[model samples]
Target: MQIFVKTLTGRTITLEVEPSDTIENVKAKIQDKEGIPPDQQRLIFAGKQLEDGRTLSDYNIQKESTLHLVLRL
Candidate 1:
């Protein structure tokens, strides 16, 4: 599955992922793609915080779903 990730800076990127993938995995990818470390990445979807241990399907995130990314200062 693929999803859209938007940064606080208004930058957007698409990611290819699996339903079984954990948010932590996504954060790692984001770290690689966006230069933000996983520990500093905060992901939100559907107005809820996305936990590192949770899977995409666990949150019912569908293809094209948008996830908000905030980098902790």
Candidate 2:
């Protein structure tokens, strides 16, 4: 599945991920692709903060779903 991630800097990146993929997995990829450390990355979906323990499917995320990425200062 393809997911859309929007960063605070108004940058958007498309990511290919499975529904079973954990949020942590996505964060790791974000860390590599966006140069933000996983520990400093916070993901939000539907106005709720996503937990690393949760999977995309667990959050009912679908293809083209937009995830907001906020980098901790």
> How do the residues 1-73 of candidate 2 rate in per-residue lDDT, one tens digit apiece?
8999998788899999999999999998887787788999899999899999999999999999999988887
What lDDT does the true structure give each of the candidates? Answer: 0.91, 0.91
Distance from true position, residue 23, model 1, in Å? 0.6
What is candidate 2's local distance difference test score? Answer: 0.91
What CA RMSD would you report for each candidate? 0.7, 0.8
For each candidate in turn, the TM-score is 0.95, 0.94
Residue 5: error of model 2 in Å?
Answer: 0.6
In model 1, the runs with Cα more than 4 Å from the true position are none
